[PDB]
Amino acid sequence: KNVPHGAAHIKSTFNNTIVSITDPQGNVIAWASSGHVGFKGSRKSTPFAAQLAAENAARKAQEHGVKKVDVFVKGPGSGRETAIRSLQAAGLEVGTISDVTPQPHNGCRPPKRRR
Amino acid sequence: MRPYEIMVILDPTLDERTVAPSLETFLNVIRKDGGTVDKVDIWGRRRLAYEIAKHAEGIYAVIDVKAEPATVSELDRQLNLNESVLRTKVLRTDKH
Amino acid sequence: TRKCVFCSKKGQTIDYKDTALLRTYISERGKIRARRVTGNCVQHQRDIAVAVKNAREVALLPFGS
Amino acid sequence: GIRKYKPTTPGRRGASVSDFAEITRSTPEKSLVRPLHGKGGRNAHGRITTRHKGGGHKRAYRVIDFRRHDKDGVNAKVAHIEYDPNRTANIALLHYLDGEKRYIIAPQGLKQGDVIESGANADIKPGNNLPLRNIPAGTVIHAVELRPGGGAKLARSAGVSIQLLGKEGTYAALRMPSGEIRRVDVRCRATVGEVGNAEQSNINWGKAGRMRWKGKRPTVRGVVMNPVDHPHGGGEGKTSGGRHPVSPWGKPEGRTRKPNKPSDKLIVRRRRTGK
Amino acid sequence: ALTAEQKKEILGQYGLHDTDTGSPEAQVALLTKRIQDLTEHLKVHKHDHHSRRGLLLLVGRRRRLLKYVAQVDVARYRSLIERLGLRR
RNA sequence: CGCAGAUAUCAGGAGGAACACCGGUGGCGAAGGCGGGUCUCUGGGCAGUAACUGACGCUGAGGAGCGAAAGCGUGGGGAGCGAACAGGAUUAGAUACCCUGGUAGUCCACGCCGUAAACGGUGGGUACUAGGUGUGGGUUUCCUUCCUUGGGAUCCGUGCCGUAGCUA
RNA sequence: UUUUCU
Ligand SMILES: [Mg+2]
Ligand SMILES: [Mg+2]
Ligand SMILES: [Mg+2]
Ligand SMILES: [Mg+2]
Ligand SMILES: [Mg+2]
Ligand SMILES: [Mg+2]
Ligand SMILES: [Mg+2]
Ligand SMILES: [Mg+2]
Ligand SMILES: [Mg+2]
Ligand SMILES: [Mg+2]
Ligand SMILES: [Mg+2]
Ligand SMILES: [Mg+2]
Ligand SMILES: [Mg+2]
Ligand SMILES: [Mg+2]
Ligand SMILES: [Mg+2]
Ligand SMILES: [Mg+2]
Ligand SMILES: [Mg+2]
Ligand SMILES: [Mg+2]
Ligand SMILES: [Mg+2]
Ligand SMILES: [Mg+2]
Ligand SMILES: [Mg+2]
Ligand SMILES: [Mg+2]
Ligand SMILES: [Mg+2]
Ligand SMILES: [Mg+2]
Ligand SMILES: [Mg+2]
Ligand SMILES: [Mg+2]
Ligand SMILES: [Mg+2]
Ligand SMILES: [Mg+2]
Ligand SMILES: [Mg+2]
Ligand SMILES: [Mg+2]
Ligand SMILES: [Mg+2]
Ligand SMILES: [Mg+2]
Ligand SMILES: [Mg+2]
Ligand SMILES: [Mg+2]
Ligand SMILES: [Mg+2]
Ligand SMILES: [Mg+2]
Ligand SMILES: [Zn+2]
């Protein structure tokens, strides 16, 4: 399969990170995560695991033949800069950067505090 | 007997010429009820901020009328009932 | 602190019609700027806020696009 | 409405009755009633088919129209709402423009002096009918047809409702009142709305006669039963029967759906109790 | 709220002379009309407890003014009572 | 919880609660409390003219009403959150602090009970006693552009620092 | 993390 334009979805939680490359129309081509890379336990939060997952995803996307990608990133900042830099250095170039995080409009109710 | 300003947004599939005939037909009821004074203006076909009813265009029309609360409420209900329209807004022109 | 230009008699009327003045008082993110920065009187700030909100509801301004 | 009795005799304490604030007449049309006879719960052979079912009161059957495709594209007017014991919910009388008279179930929220559209391209007004293919998703419906030209054979009791999920090809997904999901051809017909009189549940009877008139006979518990006629019977005193509960005929509880049914390998999932 | 037209008409109807405005009779007339139309609003608006507070305050004011008119002169008191149709 | 096809992403649909950016030691109400938008009705407050009534002012035992959240009765709805109860992990013992599940309740309509550190821990009314320094509303007069926290006079509300005095 | 008693 071949597509000229691509889109990347990346997000780092407080204790996990996942990266996926998707067709601009929505269909996904490949995905990777530190879990697939083979890190267990609290090691997920480490930025190096996110870097490895991003490298694997980029290599798979290159295998399928993706040239340009757009980034739609979200989530709390854990491996933002390292992940984006590794994606850039893997052989793909990013045209625009957009930060779209889901911000609730004072709806529902947050969980209790931790003691 | 208070000054009222109303705006109505219309879908794009209809032609521009047929718009006003509908407007006077709709407002005839208020005209014949309280002997009201009306002024009309038509200017639309502008990009919409977001998506409404799976439509990307609209027609903006503003009308100034002085009538009863009963008449204006009836007009609002009828207009909302009609399918050709999307949304209707009514507000006072005076301080309150 | 910069003076409130709307307290003048030459100031324009406040309405949701003039997209130019509606937009010039909001940030590129689509949020309403703070009193400390706009430097307007409370009444004028509130009328601007309600006017912009009505405009966003009637869909002339983006929802923070 | 709901009315609760003021206790004045020991038997009536706590009793209630539904306030019939929705009825307009108490006389069915002489041309639409058909007779019915007290039946007794037996069959041709005369054996008792189902125990403790019998007795009651004489009832006269009224015909109802569950087809609603012979007449199409012709409007109708709501005339009256009438009492009906034979089914839980109330019913309405319709006056077709051409002059015919017909009977349908009374949907929730309907009242006298209204307009009902029965066209294949009718509006979304409650009480209308049109094929599944033409109903928008997400609406609530009743009187569902199990298949085209089969008559409304589902969701006819009071307070029931069906929710329409997405659509595929010739198939559509329906949320069953009991949580199931079933597929049916879109060619069939259905009705929008739900059955009214949702206050059926709160009725408290409290009197033997109010059940006898309906025709419910006593149940006679199992343990008291003698050992010969029952599997739990016997024993000096009263006991749990000396054996895990079993039907009064030898076969225990458990699986009850016959497997390998033609629908067995086509239908999706089963119920889950109390989630 | 009462408007100029009707309020002036009540004042002319019930005034001792064309200029008095703070006369006890004009006062009671205005207060009774206010109470009447307001309670007309409240028999359809149920839980506006602030309006209920207003009711209590205005009724107390009417009671006190009626007591004053009685004290100063009870002939005018009885006459006003039978003209307005109130009980006490 | 999944390998019966999860997480993730694109399209569509269903449904409940609450409204970030305006937004603050800012405003309003007697106190509790109060802010997505439009429409209908309604209360109170302040400045000036001062036309009118002509002492009609304060107070308030008993009494009546209002009155945070929690709980109960009758009937619905229940997205998220979550007492009680199950499990996992630490501890010698956890009936807790940590985590995965979750029933009342949080919501609505109709009646209930009338309780808090309901604190400014300081009742209401009246007249007087050095200032400096912010903030909201209404009127006036002058540098005068007459734009302008330029400046002068006055009524009401709300903060900080400050003499005489009082106070262990 | 946790960490009893005089
Ligand atoms: Mg951690
Ligand atoms: Mg948590
Ligand atoms: Mg204003
Ligand atoms: Mg028959
Ligand atoms: Mg035989
Ligand atoms: Mg039986
Ligand atoms: Mg018999
Ligand atoms: Mg029935
Ligand atoms: Mg009984
Ligand atoms: Mg039995
Ligand atoms: Mg026996
Ligand atoms: Mg035997
Ligand atoms: Mg025998
Ligand atoms: Mg026995
Ligand atoms: Mg024994
Ligand atoms: Mg036993
Ligand atoms: Mg058994
Ligand atoms: Mg079942
Ligand atoms: Mg997904
Ligand atoms: Mg409080
Ligand atoms: Mg007002
Ligand atoms: Mg004078
Ligand atoms: Mg009360
Ligand atoms: Mg409560
Ligand atoms: Mg309890
Ligand atoms: Mg309760
Ligand atoms: Mg319940
Ligand atoms: Mg749910
Ligand atoms: Mg446990
Ligand atoms: Mg917990
Ligand atoms: Mg939970
Ligand atoms: Mg106390
Ligand atoms: Mg004092
Ligand atoms: Mg001050
Ligand atoms: Mg000193
Ligand atoms: Mg002291
Ligand atoms: Zn200003």
Coordinates of C-alpha atoms in Angstrom, one line a residue, chain D residues 37-260:
Chain D
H37 CA -66.9 -16.9 25.4
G38 CA -65.6 -17.9 28.8
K39 CA -63.0 -20.5 28.0
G40 CA -61.9 -22.2 31.3
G41 CA -58.3 -23.0 30.4
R42 CA -58.9 -26.5 29.0
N43 CA -58.5 -27.7 25.4
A44 CA -60.1 -30.1 23.0
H45 CA -59.1 -33.1 25.0
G46 CA -60.5 -31.6 28.1
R47 CA -57.3 -32.1 30.2
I48 CA -56.2 -29.2 32.4
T49 CA -53.5 -27.7 30.2
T50 CA -52.3 -25.1 32.8
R51 CA -53.0 -25.4 36.5
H52 CA -54.7 -22.6 38.5
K53 CA -56.0 -20.7 35.5
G54 CA -59.7 -20.2 35.3
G55 CA -62.8 -18.3 36.4
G56 CA -63.2 -14.5 36.0
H57 CA -65.7 -12.3 34.2
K58 CA -67.4 -12.2 30.8
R59 CA -65.5 -10.0 28.3
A60 CA -66.4 -8.9 24.8
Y61 CA -63.6 -8.8 22.2
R62 CA -63.0 -5.8 20.0
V63 CA -61.1 -6.0 16.7
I64 CA -57.9 -4.1 16.2
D65 CA -56.0 -3.3 13.0
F66 CA -52.4 -4.5 13.1
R67 CA -51.8 -4.4 9.4
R68 CA -51.9 -0.6 8.5
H69 CA -50.7 -1.0 4.9
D70 CA -54.0 -1.5 3.1
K71 CA -54.7 2.2 3.6
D72 CA -51.7 4.4 2.7
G73 CA -51.2 8.1 2.1
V74 CA -54.6 9.0 3.6
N75 CA -54.7 11.2 6.7
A76 CA -56.6 10.3 9.9
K77 CA -58.1 12.1 12.9
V78 CA -58.0 11.1 16.6
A79 CA -61.5 10.9 17.9
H80 CA -61.7 9.1 21.3
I81 CA -59.9 6.9 23.8
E82 CA -61.8 3.9 25.0
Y83 CA -61.6 1.4 27.9
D84 CA -60.3 -2.1 27.0
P85 CA -59.7 -4.9 29.5
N86 CA -58.5 -7.5 27.0
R87 CA -55.1 -5.7 26.8
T88 CA -53.1 -3.8 29.4
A89 CA -53.0 -0.4 27.8
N90 CA -55.6 1.9 26.3
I91 CA -56.7 2.3 22.7
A92 CA -57.9 5.0 20.3
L93 CA -60.5 5.4 17.7
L94 CA -59.5 6.7 14.3
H95 CA -61.6 8.5 11.7
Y96 CA -60.1 8.2 8.2
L97 CA -60.8 11.0 5.7
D98 CA -62.5 8.6 3.3
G99 CA -64.9 7.7 6.2
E100 CA -63.6 4.3 7.4
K101 CA -63.3 3.6 11.1
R102 CA -60.5 1.6 12.6
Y103 CA -58.8 0.8 15.9
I104 CA -55.2 1.0 17.1
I105 CA -53.3 1.0 20.3
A106 CA -53.2 4.3 22.1
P107 CA -49.6 5.7 22.2
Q108 CA -48.2 7.5 25.1
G109 CA -48.8 11.2 25.1
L110 CA -51.6 11.2 22.6
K111 CA -54.8 13.1 23.2
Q112 CA -58.1 13.9 21.6
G113 CA -58.3 16.1 18.5
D114 CA -55.1 15.5 16.7
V115 CA -53.8 14.5 13.3
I116 CA -52.1 11.1 12.5
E117 CA -50.2 10.5 9.3
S118 CA -50.0 6.9 8.0
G119 CA -48.1 7.5 4.7
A120 CA -45.0 5.7 3.7
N121 CA -43.3 9.1 3.6
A122 CA -45.2 10.5 6.6
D123 CA -43.9 12.8 9.3
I124 CA -42.2 11.8 12.6
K125 CA -45.3 12.6 14.6
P126 CA -46.0 9.9 17.2
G127 CA -48.5 7.3 16.0
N128 CA -47.4 7.3 12.4
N129 CA -46.3 4.3 10.4
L130 CA -43.7 3.8 7.7
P131 CA -41.2 1.1 6.7
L132 CA -38.0 0.6 8.7
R133 CA -36.0 1.6 5.7
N134 CA -37.3 5.2 6.0
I135 CA -37.0 5.8 9.8
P136 CA -34.1 7.9 11.0
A137 CA -31.7 6.3 13.5
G138 CA -32.1 6.8 17.2
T139 CA -35.9 7.0 17.4
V140 CA -38.1 5.0 19.7
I141 CA -40.7 2.6 18.1
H142 CA -43.3 0.0 19.0
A143 CA -45.6 -2.5 17.3
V144 CA -42.6 -4.0 15.4
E145 CA -43.2 -6.5 12.6
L146 CA -41.0 -9.6 12.9
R147 CA -40.9 -9.6 9.1
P148 CA -42.6 -7.8 6.1
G149 CA -46.4 -8.3 6.0
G150 CA -46.5 -10.1 9.3
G151 CA -48.4 -7.7 11.5
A152 CA -47.1 -6.0 14.7
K153 CA -46.2 -9.0 16.9
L154 CA -43.9 -7.4 19.4
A155 CA -43.7 -4.7 22.1
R156 CA -47.5 -4.3 22.7
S157 CA -47.6 -4.1 26.5
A158 CA -47.8 -0.9 28.6
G159 CA -44.6 1.0 29.1
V160 CA -42.5 -1.1 26.6
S161 CA -40.3 0.6 24.0
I162 CA -37.8 -0.3 21.3
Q163 CA -34.7 1.8 20.4
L164 CA -33.4 1.8 16.8
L165 CA -29.6 1.4 16.3
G166 CA -27.7 1.8 13.1
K167 CA -28.5 0.2 9.8
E168 CA -26.8 -2.1 7.3
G169 CA -27.8 -3.2 3.8
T170 CA -31.2 -4.9 4.3
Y171 CA -30.6 -5.4 8.0
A172 CA -31.2 -3.1 11.0
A173 CA -30.4 -3.4 14.7
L174 CA -33.0 -3.0 17.4
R175 CA -32.5 -2.7 21.2
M176 CA -34.9 -5.2 22.8
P177 CA -36.8 -4.0 26.0
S178 CA -34.9 -6.7 27.8
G179 CA -31.5 -5.6 26.5
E180 CA -31.2 -8.0 23.6
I181 CA -30.2 -7.0 20.0
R182 CA -31.9 -8.6 17.1
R183 CA -31.7 -8.2 13.3
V184 CA -34.7 -7.9 11.0
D185 CA -35.4 -7.0 7.4
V186 CA -35.9 -3.3 6.8
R187 CA -38.9 -4.1 4.5
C188 CA -41.1 -4.5 7.5
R189 CA -43.4 -1.9 9.1
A190 CA -43.4 -0.4 12.5
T191 CA -44.8 2.5 14.6
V192 CA -43.1 5.4 16.3
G193 CA -43.7 6.0 20.0
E194 CA -44.3 3.8 23.1
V195 CA -47.3 2.4 24.8
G196 CA -48.9 4.7 27.3
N197 CA -50.4 4.1 30.8
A198 CA -46.9 3.6 32.3
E199 CA -48.5 3.6 35.8
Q200 CA -49.6 0.0 35.5
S201 CA -46.9 -1.1 37.9
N202 CA -48.0 0.8 41.0
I203 CA -51.4 -0.8 41.2
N204 CA -51.9 -2.5 44.6
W205 CA -54.9 -4.8 44.8
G206 CA -54.9 -6.2 48.3
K207 CA -58.2 -8.2 47.8
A208 CA -59.0 -11.7 46.7
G209 CA -61.9 -10.7 44.5
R210 CA -59.9 -8.3 42.4
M211 CA -57.7 -11.3 41.4
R212 CA -60.6 -13.7 41.0
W213 CA -62.5 -11.4 38.6
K214 CA -59.4 -11.5 36.4
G215 CA -59.2 -15.3 36.8
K216 CA -56.3 -16.3 38.9
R217 CA -56.7 -19.4 41.0
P218 CA -54.7 -20.3 44.1
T219 CA -51.2 -21.8 43.8
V220 CA -51.0 -24.5 46.5
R221 CA -47.4 -24.6 47.7
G222 CA -45.2 -27.6 46.9
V223 CA -43.9 -28.8 50.3
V224 CA -47.4 -29.2 51.7
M225 CA -48.2 -31.4 48.7
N226 CA -48.5 -35.2 49.3
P227 CA -45.5 -37.3 48.1
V228 CA -47.5 -39.1 45.4
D229 CA -48.7 -36.1 43.4
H230 CA -45.4 -34.1 43.9
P231 CA -41.7 -34.6 44.1
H232 CA -41.2 -32.5 47.2
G233 CA -44.2 -34.1 49.0
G234 CA -44.0 -36.2 52.2
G235 CA -42.1 -35.9 55.4
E236 CA -43.3 -35.4 59.0
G237 CA -43.4 -31.7 59.8
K238 CA -42.4 -29.2 57.0
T239 CA -39.1 -29.4 55.1
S240 CA -37.4 -28.1 52.0
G241 CA -38.5 -31.4 50.3
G242 CA -35.3 -33.4 50.9
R243 CA -34.1 -32.7 47.4
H244 CA -32.9 -29.6 45.4
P245 CA -35.8 -27.8 43.9
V246 CA -37.2 -29.4 40.7
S247 CA -40.3 -28.8 38.6
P248 CA -43.4 -30.7 39.8
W249 CA -42.9 -33.1 36.9
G250 CA -39.3 -34.4 37.2
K251 CA -37.2 -32.1 35.0
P252 CA -35.0 -29.5 36.8
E253 CA -34.2 -25.9 36.0
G254 CA -31.5 -24.7 33.6
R255 CA -31.3 -24.5 29.8
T256 CA -34.7 -23.9 28.2
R257 CA -34.0 -22.7 24.7
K258 CA -34.0 -25.6 22.1
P259 CA -30.5 -25.5 20.5
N260 CA -29.9 -25.7 16.7

